[PDB]
Swiss-Prot record, chains A, B:
The postsynaptic actions of Glu are mediated by a variety of receptors that are named according to their selective agonists. This receptor binds domoate > kainate >> L-glutamate = quisqualate >> AMPA = NMDA. L-glutamate binds at residues 88, 90, 95, 141-142, 189. Belongs to the glutamate-gated ion channel (TC 1.A.10.1) family. GRIK3 subfamily. It is found in: Cell membrane; Postsynaptic cell membrane. Ionotropic glutamate receptor that functions as a cation-permeable ligand-gated ion channel, gated by L-glutamate and the glutamatergic agonist kainic acid. Binding of the excitatory neurotransmitter L-glutamate induces a conformation change, leading to the opening of the cation channel, and thereby converts the chemical signal to an electrical impulse. The receptor then desensitizes rapidly and enters a transient inactive state, characterized by the presence of bound agonist. Glycans are attached at residues 3, 202. Expressed in the olfactory bulb (at protein level). Expressed in the deep cortical layers, dentate gyrus, reticular thalamic nucleus, mammillary bodies, pons, and cerebellum of the adult. It comes from Rattus norvegicus. Mass spectrometry data suggest the protein is N-glycosylated at five distinct sites. This is Glutamate receptor ionotropic, kainate 3. The chain holds residues 432 to 806 of 919 of the full protein. Homotetramer, and heterotetramer with GRIK4 or GRIK5. Can form functional heteromeric receptors with GRIK2. Interacts with PRKCABP. Interacts with NETO2. Residues 119-253 are extracellular.
Length: 253, 253
């Protein structure tokens, strides 16, 4: 209870959480590596806890349907099926109504991922047309941002995204593949765009950040572990350790 | 001191925290009433704690200066000079880097307060001119939102606000008085606009919400009281008690 291993829910998302490469068939925690895994390891060392990592079955971050029911990692936390969600889980007002988060460990904002070619320069350029299709990860924070926005440009974008069955993609990976194979722009969080555009040299960020927010480790509301994790994150940041960790995992003509 | 009274920092802001009317000279907690005071009282009853309310000396909510030093209620929490900040304290990413918040007890967004007359309709209308001056409360969340935005319209607005000495006002009251005596629009949080426009029938909200976020009870990072307060808030909301409390305090031709 006070010594048990914490159940950690996560999902695969480069470079935060990945299956590490090996010839062996791997099992347990050893399967995983990445920025969020390094963060979890450092926290576990500092705070003296152990854990078991489990992939969220539905592969989603989490959003509410019209009856108010959640899915994804958010639902795992609400149900107390996990103690921590260690992932690039965006801290949002709608989620703070249902679950808790550590202090943020990374800052990001929504922006646009698109192929180098047609020189569009902003969301305004996307919103005023449909030839270039656009969308976001289904049941993630970006989708929810557009769904909830009352800013005219973003309302127009939500009207389009939500009417076009192909527009909302299962995960970043499907979205990135779409930007590579179709005339499609993905509304994406900015540090992920940074990572992707350093590796796919034909992709680029379009425009700037639409907002500025954070990723946190999710917990069930009122978790006994959340506070110590927050304080440990704060101290890692005072010493620039998270900046260094980012450089490790983010490290074109 | 697991029985000690909690120190509560606050500031005067109608209808959240106000000096109650009396012929007597009042002292201590008895001086205060309002939506946030009712919320505090209900939480204290549910959770079995006592408190001493103190007005923040500088009358500010809190923002960081160029060297990263905070002021206002946020600084009181950072310094652990208060246990709770019971006020309409906006939950924001930049603040979550330094302090903690309960789950939100109220949803709001930035909008515009302006005198019925010139029929402007949106922030875009303000941003494209200067005859109608505009601004926000100095060292509050709205100011910070504009200072940090990379959305073109809001960048232009910040460029103007931050150049014009009169534009940033000390508190809502000064800003409201300014909308009444000058051709000035105040960027203001929406539930406060709702309260003000029901009482000052010559004022109105211009446009919709620019964002959607929450007020929470602020605590120092690491607080032993924050979780129980969050759970109690959740349960008040499940039963619609906060909606009823808003009707009480918010209740023209
Ligand atoms: N990090 C997001 C998912 C990605 C996105 O929505 O763009 C979340 O927590 O929902
Ligand atoms: N509620 C705001 C102050 C008002 C404003 O910024 O509009 C805060 O917590 O900073
Ligand atoms: Cl698994
Ligand atoms: Cl850091
Ligand atoms: Cl006082
Ligand atoms: Cl309620
Ligand atoms: Na393998
Ligand atoms: Na007591
Ligand atoms: Na009196």
């Amino acid at each position: 209870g006070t010594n048990r291993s914490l159940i950690v829910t996560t999902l695969l998302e480069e470079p935060f959480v990945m299956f590490r490469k090996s010839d062996r068939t791997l099992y347990g925690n050893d399967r995983f590596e990445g920025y969020c895994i390094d963060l979890l390891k450092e926290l576990a060392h500092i705070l003296g806890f152990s854990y078991e990592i489990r992939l969220v079955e539905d592969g989603k971050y989490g959003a509410q349907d019209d009856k108010g029911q959640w899915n994804g990692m958010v639902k795992e936390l609400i149900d107390h099926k996990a103690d921590l969600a260690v992932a690039p889980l965006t801290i949002t007002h709608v989620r703070e109504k249902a679950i808790d988060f550590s202090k943020p460990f990374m800052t990001l904002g929504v922006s646009i991922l698109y192929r180098k070619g047609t020189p569009i320069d902003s969301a305004d350029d996307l919103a005023k047309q449909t030839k270039i299709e656009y969308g976001a990860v289904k049941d993630g924070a970006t989708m929810t941002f557009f769904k909830k926005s009352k800013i005219s440009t973003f309302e127009k974008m939500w009207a389009f995204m939500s009417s076009k069955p192909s527009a909302l993609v299962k995960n970043n990976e499907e979205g990135i593949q779409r930007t590579l194979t179709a005339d499609y722009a993905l509304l994406m969080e900015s540090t992920t765009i940074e990572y992707i555009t350093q590796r796919n040299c034909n992709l680029t960020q379009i425009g700037g950040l639409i907002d500025s927010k954070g990723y946190g480790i999710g917990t069930p509301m009122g978790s006994p572990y959340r506070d110590k994790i927050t304080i440990a994150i704060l101290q890692l940041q005072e010493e620039d350790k998270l900046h260094i960790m980012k450089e490790k995992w983010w490290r074109c003509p």
